[PDB]
């Protein structure tokens, strides 16, 4: 209980230094445009769910929204990998935003086959083609690259890190969908795995006037 | 001016275990892996395993599995191989190189009372 | 894992001639081969990889050639400077595997 407010403020922290992260430069991107939505989705419900816990209204439009947009991203991932050119699906900007946009009203329109199944039923295999045709060309690779030298490795992880991001909003919301407060903690997991795996790092821990491990 | 520094020597007791380390510094450390390949007295090569510094995949070798634990330090630029349980037969010299392109100096690791 | 033997062992060469190691792996290799030489009091210095290509520095004199599962490092006009332990590694898969090395002396 009240030990358990400490749980808030990390719905409300934890989302926020992540918002303010991408509203820099290099983080900005389709990808991270998308897991920036999942920060209005776990803040929103964490000053507006959280607090008061249309206090249910905003609890599915929220919740509806996720397994949802982790149903675009996977898909986006894909249109990246299976294109023909470089990494980075071809969503445009505006059209990552307008994308964006239809993913709310619709999640506000809005069942656990259309707001958790079917969102939940492509997704693991839109991914898990994906995780695994990302396999075949990463050593398709020339062995000699990189030990000789004179998508890779690194985008290998960026998959990692997109993949247990997925794979823990699974293993949260399922056991609820087949436990209520279980599916709340996938609110400060998120912000908690892209330290100790993506970019994001240093983006939002040393944006904070310097962490720790700034040459400390 | 391209160059993987090492110990060269390295006593250890028995039981005991030793963390060889080997300051790359003439290149970029995140664009190639680095494997760390023992050579025993004598002849003969063994691969102990290779860690990729950029990403943070290890692959060891199924040998030296449990036994060494590879790692990286991406602001050193330097990386580190775990030699744990040492026996008389660990002794050796310990290659640290870089991909087998470049080799390093070498550490003559000798596990001893 | 995949042995890899290499004759020969031993070899003594005079001056000028040419001399030749070969490398026969037990898989499959896609030309994932390298050729390196062990001096006595120094670490090895790596000649060739992708089975042919000369590593940035090494005397063109060396050369690498073979496909698939055999191979065979070759100097053409063998310098004094030429002797030592010339080894042959794969990368092919794990556990990366290193020949044996042949020997190289020169006779005087």
């Known amino acids: 209980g009240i030990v358990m407010s400490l749980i808030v403020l990390a719905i409300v922290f934890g989302n926020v230094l992540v918002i303010t992260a991408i509203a820099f430069e290099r983080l900005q991107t389709v990808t991270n445009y998308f897991i920036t939505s999942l920060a209005c989705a776990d803040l929103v419900m964490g000053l507006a769910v959280v607090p008061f816990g249309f206090w249910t209204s905003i609890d599915v439009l929220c919740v509806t929204a996720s397994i949802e947009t982790l149903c675009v991203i996977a898909v986006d991932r894909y249109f990246a990998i299976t294109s023909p050119f470089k990494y980075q699906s071809l969503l445009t900007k505006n059209k990552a935003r307008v994308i964006i946009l239809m993913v709310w009203i619709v999640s506000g329109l809005t069942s656990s086959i259309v707001s958790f199944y079917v969102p939940l039923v492509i997704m693991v295999f839109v991914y898990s083609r994906v995780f695994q045709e990302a396999k075949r060309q990463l050593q398709k690779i020339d062995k000699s690259e990189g030990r000789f030298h004179v998508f890779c490795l690194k985008e290998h992880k960026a998959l990692k890190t997109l993949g247990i991001i997925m794979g823990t909003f699974t293993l949260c919301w399922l056991p609820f969908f087949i436990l209520n407060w279980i599916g709340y903690v996938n609110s400060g997991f998120n912000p908690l795995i892209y330290c100790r795996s993506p970019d994001f790092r240093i983006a939002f821990q040393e944006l904070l006037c310097l962490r720790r491990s700034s040459l400390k | 001016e391209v160059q993987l520094q090492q110990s060269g020597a390295e006593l250890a007791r028995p039981g005991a275990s030793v963390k060889l380390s080997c300051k790359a510094s003439?290149?970029?450390?995140?664009?190639?892996?680095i494997n760390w390949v023992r050579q025993r007295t004598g002849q003969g090569f063994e691969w102990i395993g290779e860690?990729?510094?950029?990403?943070?995949?290890?692959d060891y070798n199924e040998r030296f599995k449990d036994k060494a634990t590879l790692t990286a330090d991406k602001s050193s630029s330097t990386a580190y191989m775990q030699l744990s349980s040492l026996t008389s037969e660990d002794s050796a010299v310990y290659f640290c190189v870089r991909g087998f392109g470049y080799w390093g100096q070498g550490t003559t690791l000798t596990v001893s009372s | 894992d995949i042995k890899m033997t290499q004759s020969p062992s031993s070899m003594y060469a005079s001056l000028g001639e040419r001399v030749t190691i070969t490398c026969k792996a037990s898989?499959?290799?896609?030309?994932?081969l390298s050729w390196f030489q062990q001096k006595p009091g120094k670490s090895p210095k790596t000649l060739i990889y992708?089975?042919?290509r000369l590593v940035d520095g090494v005397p063109s004199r060396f050369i690498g050639t073979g496909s698939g599962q055999d191979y065979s490092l070759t100097i053409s006009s063998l310098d004094y400077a030429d002797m030592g332990i010339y080894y042959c590694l794969q990368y092919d898969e794990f556990p990366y595997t290193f020949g044996g090395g042949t020997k190289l002396e020169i006779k005087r």
């Open positions: 860690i990729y510094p950029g990403s943070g995949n290890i």
């Open positions: 898989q499959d290799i896609n030309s994932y």
């Open positions: 003439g290149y970029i450390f995140t664009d190639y892996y």
């Open positions: 992708r089975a042919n």
